[PDB]
């Protein structure tokens, strides 16, 4: 629904992000869908270019995860990557940041399948959207 | 709490929450309720965020279904009233199922009613969106007695057919005045399903033996008649209930297919 | 943000959990009269 989107792909040339996706095997924590949803959340919150970064990415991915995934454990694995070494008591103020992001998008986390596929309909050549799980 | 509106004449309620992170169930409840606007579903007017505490805002119905069912054991419920309630539930559930929603909890305390003869769904806390494919699913889902057999056994990627079953278990409850399958535990409750509805088989179900929890040590029970197990129902009622509860999830009647059933010829709004 | 707006609409600051202002009639009722859902707490994830 908007043609720029280029500031969002910039995150995936980043190191910690790339290694984070390499860490992801079966696409449990980051699905090609969840990485689309993490973008939809960026639009809904109306982020600036200054506002897309590491923390604001993981914070959205955690939300998409807790919404669309009934497996309640694996999504924790985001914490060491976002918050560094000690996330141990540093995860809660991350959670409140998630809640704030949720406050910014006006509480609609739910993203339809078609809407998810329509945001990857832009540049399908990108590698992200070739990552999918099965069974 | 509670509330009252001197203008427009409506009533709402608070239901606060409140310590290191917001619950994952509340996020689903709220996020789903904001995407669902239906006359047959409880609504969500507003949601706040303040420090230690989070309040919701809910349209206030006067009671739930249990206390209304507990209201009369002695007398029953008028069959047109039951037809209205069930038609309503099936309608709102048709709105849920058809677009990106599975409740995965249906019990009378999650069903709210009012004095104007309306009934609405509540507690989407365990609900989710099934639209996005290849997701993860817990197979402990609905509460106790209302569980579907396929989820009672091992089943992966269970579809919308799990809610309908619950409604069936609700249906009978509004008729016999009591619970349908008063299971004391898992298995158990399954064998009660086997007692009333009969022991399954590959004639009824394609993959019944291929279900992981299933072992053929199960006692074989035949299918009890629906005159004995639920007498007050008419032939149309039994006709609906029969295809409403059947072991095969692939057969089980959808919501949109329920609304047109001959049992609903007499539907009213008392 | 929106909590002052929610305050504006719902005639309440969220505050003490039981003040009021006007344009809405706010009560405090007994939990026993509510249909179990409204005072229903969250559920354990386990």
From Swiss-Prot, chain A:
Tissue: Highly expressed in testis. Expressed at a low level in wide range of tissues including bone marrow, brain, heart, kidney, colon, liver, placenta, spleen, skeletal muscle, salivary gland, thyroid gland, thymus, trachea and uterus. Expressed at a slightly higher level in adrenal gland, cerebellum, small intestine, lung, prostate and trachea. Expression is cell cycle-dependent, being restricted to cells in G1/S phase.
Membrane-spanning residues: none
Region Speedy/Ringo box, annotated ranges: 2-134
Cellular localisation: Nucleus
Subunit structure: Interacts with CDK1. Interacts with CDK2. May interact with CDKN1B/KIP1. Identified in a complex with CDK2 and CDKN1B/KIP1, where it interacts primarily with CDK2.
Family (UniProt): Belongs to the Speedy/Ringo family.
Primary role: Regulates the G1/S phase transition of the cell cycle by binding and activating CDK1 and CDK2. Contributes to CDK2 activation without promoting CDK2 phosphorylation, by inducing a conformation change of the CDK2 T-loop that obstructs the substrate-binding cleft prior to kinase activation. Mediates cell survival during the DNA damage process through activation of CDK2.
Domains as described in the record: The C-terminus is required for CDK2-activation, but not CDK2-binding.
Record-given protein name: Speedy protein A
Organism phylogeny: Eukaryota, Metazoa, Chordata, Craniata, Vertebrata
UniProtKB/Swiss-Prot annotation, chain B:
Amino-acid positions noted as binding ATP in the UniProt annotation, renumbered to this chain: 15, 59-61, 64, 107-110, 123
PROSITE patterns noted in UniProt: PROTEIN_KINASE_ATP (PS00107), PROTEIN_KINASE_DOM (PS50011), PROTEIN_KINASE_ST (PS00108)
Phosphotyrosine, modified sites: 1
The enzyme's E.C. designation: 2.7.11.22
One GO-annotated biological process of the protein: cellular response to nitric oxide
Pfam families assigned to the protein according to its UniProt record, in alphabetical order: Pkinase
Name of this protein: Cyclin-dependent kinase 2
Curated annotation (Swiss-Prot), chain C:
Region feature Interaction with CDK2, mapped onto this chain: 1-41
Expression tissues: Expressed in kidney (at protein level). Expressed in all tissues tested. Highest levels in skeletal muscle, lowest in liver and kidney.
Modification Phosphotyrosine, positions: 24, 38-39
Mod. after translation: Phosphorylated; phosphorylation occurs on serine, threonine and tyrosine residues. Phosphorylation on other sites is greatly enhanced by mitogens, growth factors, cMYC and in certain cancer cell lines. The phosphorylated form found in the cytoplasm is inactivate. Ubiquitinated; in the cytoplasm by the KPC complex (composed of RNF123/KPC1 and UBAC1/KPC2) and, in the nucleus, by SCF(SKP2). Ubiquitinated; by a TRIM21-containing SCF(SKP2)-like complex; leads to its degradation.
Entry text on domains: A peptide sequence containing only AA 28-79 retains substantial Kip1 cyclin A/CDK2 inhibitory activity.
UniProt similarity note: Belongs to the CDI family.
Known partners and oligomeric status: Forms a ternary complex composed of CCNE1, CDK2 and CDKN1B. Interacts with COPS5, subunit of the COP9 signalosome complex; the interaction leads to CDKN1B degradation. Interacts with NUP50; the interaction leads to nuclear import and degradation of phosphorylated CDKN1B. Interacts with CCND1 and SNX6.
Miscellaneous information on this protein: Decreased levels of p27Kip1, mainly due to proteasomal degradation, are found in various epithelial tumors originating from lung, breast, colon, ovary, esophagus, thyroid and prostate.
Disease: Multiple endocrine neoplasia 4: Multiple endocrine neoplasia (MEN) syndromes are inherited cancer syndromes of the thyroid. MEN4 is a MEN-like syndrome with a phenotypic overlap of both MEN1 and MEN2.
Name of the protein in question: Cyclin-dependent kinase inhibitor 1B
Organism expressing this protein natively: Homo sapiens
GN (gene name): CDKN1B
